[PDB]
Ligand binder design. Structure first.
Ligand SMILES: [Mg+2]
Ligand SMILES: [Mg+2]
Ligand SMILES: [Mg+2]
Ligand SMILES: [Mg+2]
Ligand SMILES: [Mg+2]
Ligand SMILES: [Mg+2]
Ligand SMILES: [Mg+2]
Ligand SMILES: [Mg+2]
Ligand SMILES: [Mg+2]
Ligand SMILES: [Mg+2]
Ligand SMILES: [Mg+2]
Ligand SMILES: [Mg+2]
Ligand SMILES: [Mg+2]
Ligand SMILES: [Mg+2]
Ligand SMILES: [Mg+2]
Ligand SMILES: [Mg+2]
Ligand SMILES: [Mg+2]
Ligand SMILES: [Mg+2]
Ligand SMILES: [Mg+2]
Ligand SMILES: [Mg+2]
Ligand SMILES: [Mg+2]
Ligand SMILES: [Mg+2]
Ligand SMILES: [Mg+2]
Ligand SMILES: [Mg+2]
Ligand SMILES: [Mg+2]
Ligand SMILES: [Mg+2]
Ligand SMILES: [Mg+2]
Ligand SMILES: [Mg+2]
Ligand SMILES: [Mg+2]
Ligand SMILES: [Mg+2]
Ligand SMILES: [Mg+2]
Ligand SMILES: [Mg+2]
Ligand SMILES: [Mg+2]
Ligand SMILES: [Mg+2]
Ligand SMILES: [Mg+2]
Ligand SMILES: [Mg+2]
Ligand SMILES: [Mg+2]
Ligand SMILES: [Mg+2]
Ligand SMILES: [Mg+2]
Ligand SMILES: [Mg+2]
Ligand SMILES: [Mg+2]
Ligand SMILES: [Mg+2]
Ligand SMILES: [Mg+2]
Ligand SMILES: [Mg+2]
Ligand SMILES: [Mg+2]
Lengths: 94, 116, 136, 58, 75
RNA sequence: UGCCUGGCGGCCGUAGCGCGGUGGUCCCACCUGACCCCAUGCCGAACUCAGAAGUGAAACGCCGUAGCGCCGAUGGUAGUGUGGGGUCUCCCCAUGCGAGAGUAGGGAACUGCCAGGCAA
RNA sequence: GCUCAACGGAUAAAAGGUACUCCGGGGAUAACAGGCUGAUACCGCCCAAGAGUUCAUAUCGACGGCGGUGUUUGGCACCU
RNA sequence: UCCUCCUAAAGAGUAACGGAGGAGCACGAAGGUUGGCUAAUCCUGGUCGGACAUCAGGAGGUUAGUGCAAUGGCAUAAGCC
RNA sequence: CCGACUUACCAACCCGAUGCAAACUGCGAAUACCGGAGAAUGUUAUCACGGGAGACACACGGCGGGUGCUAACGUCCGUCGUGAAGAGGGAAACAACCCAGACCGCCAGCUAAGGUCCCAAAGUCAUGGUUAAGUGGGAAACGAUGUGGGAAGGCCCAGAC
């Protein structure tokens, strides 16, 4: 049931990335395979709960972005240095 | 190694020669077949090249691995280089001690008209 | 007290403490005491926060010290006018940035380690927090 | 070619030397001094340099 | 005990890339051999690279050791 | 025109090592011998000369393998020019610039002038 | 031919006392007092091993931490 | 007084009784050129011989050396004969 | 003597993992600076030569640092602004802070910073929340069913606290 809701970003970079991270929405990206790396934007509260379970980093996930399902594996994650939250996650399209 | 030790001995005279912008006569020696060729200042292409490996030279020799064979090369290069108009060249030993076949190649080239 | 055995130079600059730390993840043990507030820990404080940490979780367990001073701090004697040179090195501090795991513990219950890091946090100046080793 | 309008909205007193020099390069003298310059990336870079004190209108 | 220092030697790269120089003009005033003598550029006893011809400076990165070189295209 | 080999380069680790296989018609290296040219601060090791029975072990070249070296995005983060703000020994906001490391992956080079051998 | 090394070298050649002192200046610069600061000083608080027959907090308080005051010793020379 | 590094904020310069160290020479060769050569340290073996003399090979790779302090540089060697 | 095994211990070098550096660099910005080209703009703002000088006690604020105690309206530099040599409005008053550069006059208007209940010119304005402390209107570690918002989870009239 590891199905995360995501979106498609339209803005990026230091200014545009922190701007939405201040709204419970931390960015991410889906790369790997043959496609172009997709700028995935997703909610924080839901994902913050999913990563509590250790199966999150082992089981193949499912990202429903704009209807299109993408099955991935959480590759790299950036936690906030001292606060219990996230900043960005690398999803290898597996 | 015997081969790589020779290349570092050549580097001194190779690098000094291209800044000057000279047309060097690169002579390669081997226990058999003493080679020789004239290379343009651009360091890329040769203009005149003659050695004993050519059938035009080997068929007029007793053995392509000695002085009289080396004297046959220098004359051939210096006579076909005086055909292309390359007169004033430089002599690059290629790390070889200027004493035997490398000396005989120059002596045959100096008398022909190849200026160096 | 943790002190460097013969560094290259005796005295060194003050230096600013800007930025965020790097040793952020719990690596050796499973529980940590991440430093939230920026500051500087002397060799006395690190040593004091260890005794009253290696007392709560008895002879059992293993404690890692992810910090090491390696920064000499000068102190001029009393009644000495300014100038005349750099003072004398008295103690060694460790520049602590936010997100720097100070200690790591392993071989004990989580609730025990939760209470052990409460005894050590009261011996350190910087505000700390309790973090858990995460799966990647 | 078409032109653009630039109007200074703030003073140039407590500004860096390269900020007073830009207003000299645009022609702006005092606040409210309206000026008209050509619309080129040479000028567009000048408006973008002192954008905190100029109010451009296309 | 301290309180001693030298007089700054004013080192560094005088003429930069694309800058038209004259014969004899100093391109680089250096200590060791950070930059090397490329084409139409000599090297003094002070390891000072000067321009042996009119033209423009052209920094390069030739060689099997990626060492810096300075050439001169006659311009 | 193609596979081979040697020389002089361009570019210079995507181009270098490790392991394995492999080449001798030519070429290359090893190799045989040394009155003589020349030679070792002893010695034909090297340098040099006169030649060439034998060999492809060594050396070098080539093909495979990624066990390493190495190269390396997108995204994010660190930093930061300018203008503002704050709980102003440190940060934040607006705009512009944007690393290093790490990850997907790439990867055991590419190419030019000449001169020979070779199937044609 | 010069440690003319006070090394752009005042003479070739030169040390001290002044509470018997004097003149011209300076709060450009000290002593006393004020101001800024608060290392030290004094006071309080925090964690708490341990002491107290038993028992951390009746009473003390190790190892360390955080502030206040502007009485000490000082720092600074802003005022005279 | 002069030289090297930092301070010094990626051109140059940049202060303090700030932090670290040297010089007041040496050489007729340690200079010029030509030819050639390239290390330190370990490992294995070996008469006296030993942690460390000389010798042989391997590993390693410029961690060596550079008349002298430091920094930059160096095998195309500026290092060695 | 040779010399094997063993040890409540410490540990060289390599290997994997983890931090630190003004005097460390297999990497590496932003700016700044040097040169070329191009347009607009500026009373040539540029350089050289000559006449006259003054000045060589600087101060504070920002940023980047040395020193001190990341103390000082401290001390010393880099760079910028301001004062110095600049009034005016605001910061209660307050050279150096924010805004802004006074040729003169006017019982005219629009705005900057900052403000709009009265002292004292302008909102006792509008919508939606927060705070019980006179917080706002001096301050820390630490302490507390103070109280508001958000997400998640445990148990629950097969009866929980
Ligand atoms: Mg920003
Ligand atoms: Mg301002
Ligand atoms: Mg000095
Ligand atoms: Mg210096
Ligand atoms: Mg073989
Ligand atoms: Mg990026
Ligand atoms: Mg500060
Ligand atoms: Mg990168
Ligand atoms: Mg004198
Ligand atoms: Mg003097
Ligand atoms: Mg008298
Ligand atoms: Mg008097
Ligand atoms: Mg006093
Ligand atoms: Mg007791
Ligand atoms: Mg008092
Ligand atoms: Mg006092
Ligand atoms: Mg005074
Ligand atoms: Mg003063
Ligand atoms: Mg007074
Ligand atoms: Mg002087
Ligand atoms: Mg500089
Ligand atoms: Mg010498
Ligand atoms: Mg030589
Ligand atoms: Mg032995
Ligand atoms: Mg031995
Ligand atoms: Mg020499
Ligand atoms: Mg790397
Ligand atoms: Mg600079
Ligand atoms: Mg320019
Ligand atoms: Mg121009
Ligand atoms: Mg003076
Ligand atoms: Mg002065
Ligand atoms: Mg400062
Ligand atoms: Mg001051
Ligand atoms: Mg000053
Ligand atoms: Mg004023
Ligand atoms: Mg005023
Ligand atoms: Mg006030
Ligand atoms: Mg007033
Ligand atoms: Mg005016
Ligand atoms: Mg109005
Ligand atoms: Mg307003
Ligand atoms: Mg009113
Ligand atoms: Mg109202
Ligand atoms: Mg109050």
């Amino acid at each position: 049931m590891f199905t995360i809701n995501a979106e498609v970003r339209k803005e990026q970079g230091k200014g545009a990335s922190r701007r939405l991270r201040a709204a419970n929405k931390f960015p991410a990206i889906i790369y790997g395979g043959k496609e172009a790396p997709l700028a995935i934007e997703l909610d924080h509260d839901k994902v913050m709960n999913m990563q509590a379970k250790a199966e999150f980093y082992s089981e193949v996930l499912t990202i429903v972005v704009d209807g299109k399902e993408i099955k991935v594996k959480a590759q790299d994650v950036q936690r906030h240095p001292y606060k219990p939250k996230l900043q960005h996650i690398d999803f290898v399209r597996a | 190694d015997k081969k790589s030790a020779r290349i570092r001995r050549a580097t001194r005279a190779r690098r000094k020669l291209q800044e000057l912008g000279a047309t060097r006569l690169v002579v390669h020696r081997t226990p058999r077949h003493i080679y020789a060729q004239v290379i343009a200042p651009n360091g890329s292409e040769v203009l005149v090249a003659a050695s004993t490996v050519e059938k035009a030279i080997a068929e007029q020799l007793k053995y392509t691995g000695n002085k009289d064979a080396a004297a046959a090369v220098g004359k051939a290069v210096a006579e076909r280089a005086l055909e292309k108009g390359i007169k004033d060249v430089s002599f690059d030993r290629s790390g070889f001690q200027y004493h035997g076949r490398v000396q005989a190649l120059a002596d045959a080239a100096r008398e022909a008209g190849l200026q160096f | 007290m943790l002190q460097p055995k013969r560094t290259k130079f005796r005295k060194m600059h003050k230096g600013r403490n800007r930025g965020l730390a790097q040793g952020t993840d719990v690596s050796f043990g499973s529980f940590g005491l991440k430093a939230v507030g920026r500051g500087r820990l002397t060799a006395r404080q690190i040593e004091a926060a260890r005794r009253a940490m290696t007392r709560a979780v008895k002879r059992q367990g293993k404690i890692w010290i992810r910090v090491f001073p390696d920064k000499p701090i000068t102190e001029k004697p009393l009644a000495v006018r300014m100038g005349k040179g750099k003072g004398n090195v008295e103690y060694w501090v460790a520049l602590i940035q936010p997100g720097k795991v100070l200690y790591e513990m392993d071989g004990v219950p989580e609730e025990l380690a939760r209470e052990a890091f409460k005894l050590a946090a009261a011996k350190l100046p910087i505000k700390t927090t309790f973090v858990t080793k995460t799966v990647m | 070619a078409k032109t653009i309008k630039i109007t200074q909205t703030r003073s140039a007193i407590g500004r860096l030397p390269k900020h007073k020099a830009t207003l000299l390069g645009l022609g702006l003298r005092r606040i409210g001094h309206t000026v008209e310059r050509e619309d080129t990336p040479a000028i567009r870079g000048m408006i973008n340099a002192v954008s905190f004190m100029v109010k451009v209108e296309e | 005990r301290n309180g001693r220092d030298s007089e700054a030697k004013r080192l560094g790269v005088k003429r930069f890339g694309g800058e038209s120089v004259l014969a004899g003009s100093i391109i680089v005033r250096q200590r060791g051999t950070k930059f090397h003598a490329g084409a139409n550029v000599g090297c003094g006893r002070d390891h000072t690279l000067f321009a042996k011809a009119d033209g423009k400076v052209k920094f390069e990165v030739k060689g099997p050791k990626n060492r810096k070189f300075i050439s001169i295209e006659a311009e």
